[model samples]
Target: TELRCQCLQTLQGIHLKNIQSVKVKSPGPHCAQTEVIATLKNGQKACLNPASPMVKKIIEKMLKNGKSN
Candidate 1:
């Protein structure tokens, strides 16, 4: 069983230079909303609001340019 959503708080913008990786988590028993999690170059993690325009652009690129290997 899931306990809670990973992204209770989200940021509107995270500098692209600081991003090392971006992970997208689909809604599940743990959460009802799609979550975008970003790992920074400094080994920090942050969540991005799915509805934010900046996030939408990031997600778009993430999906289209995601590595398939």
Candidate 2:
């Protein structure tokens, strides 16, 4: 439970960087390809496509926090 909460917090803090990008592999209309990408802080990269459910959940939590005022 503690780890899960911590992971959620970490994911919430993730932010897109200018240079870094996340590469994601996913099935396209024609075939599978690693085309999706997300940029992170300090030149980090993550995959927007084919994102793991766990990752997606984390990102969602993060997005919620990001939007909170």
Candidate 3:
């Protein structure tokens, strides 16, 4: 599977980005980043970079208002 883009993370990659969750697996959450896992629209597991603003926004939204897919 291809990597998800950093814009709302809405299944926008060449293959798939339909992430179901943006769970923060942390070693760091501030100046340092961490691992974040996401599944496809159903369940194709993928990892996303937490350093991107768009991805971070999506993560926040997921943590706040549930994921969109």
Candidate 4:
């Protein structure tokens, strides 16, 4: 759990400008939360918190680049 928290803090920063693409999903029934999956140009993938403030940055960038629906 500590590692997960630490990793999330790390993810909050670090510029992900112009992400290659984004996959949106709401897993589980009635969870009311979603995972915003980001794919990098190099094929690396990371599961990100959709509610995170930083997520908006990437989503906007993705839309700007015409990468996803």
Q: Best by lDDT, which number?
A: 1
Model 1 residue 59 lDDT score: 59
Query: Whole-model lDDT for model 2 versus the true structure?
Result: 0.41
lDDT winner, 2 or 4: 4
Q: Per-residue CA lDDT of candidate 2, range 1-60, in tens?
A: 122111111232233424243434454454433344455655665444334445564445
TM-score per candidate, in order? 0.74, 0.35, 0.50, 0.59
Candidate 2 residue 17 C-alpha distance from true site, Å? 11
**How would you order the candidates by lDDT, starting with the best?**
1, 4, 3, 2
lDDT of each: 0.78, 0.41, 0.53, 0.58
Best of the candidates, TM-score: 1
Report the lDDT tens digits of candidate 3 across residue range 1-69. 334323333222222236666555655323233566676577676676666566766666655654445
Across 1-69, the per-residue lDDT of candidate 4 in tens digits comes to 122221232244235653577777654554344556677777876666666787777677767775554
Give Cα distance to truth, residue 4, candidate 3, Å.
22
Winner of 3 and 4 under lDDT: 4
Error of 1 at 25 (Å): 0.6
As a whole number from 0 to 100, the lDDT of residue 50 in candidate 4 is: 63
Higher-ranked by TM-score: 1 or 3: 1
Q: Give the per-residue lDDT digits (tens) of candidate 1, residues 35-65.
A: 8899877999889988899997765665565
By summed lDDT, the worst window of 10 consecutive residues in model 2 runs over 1-10
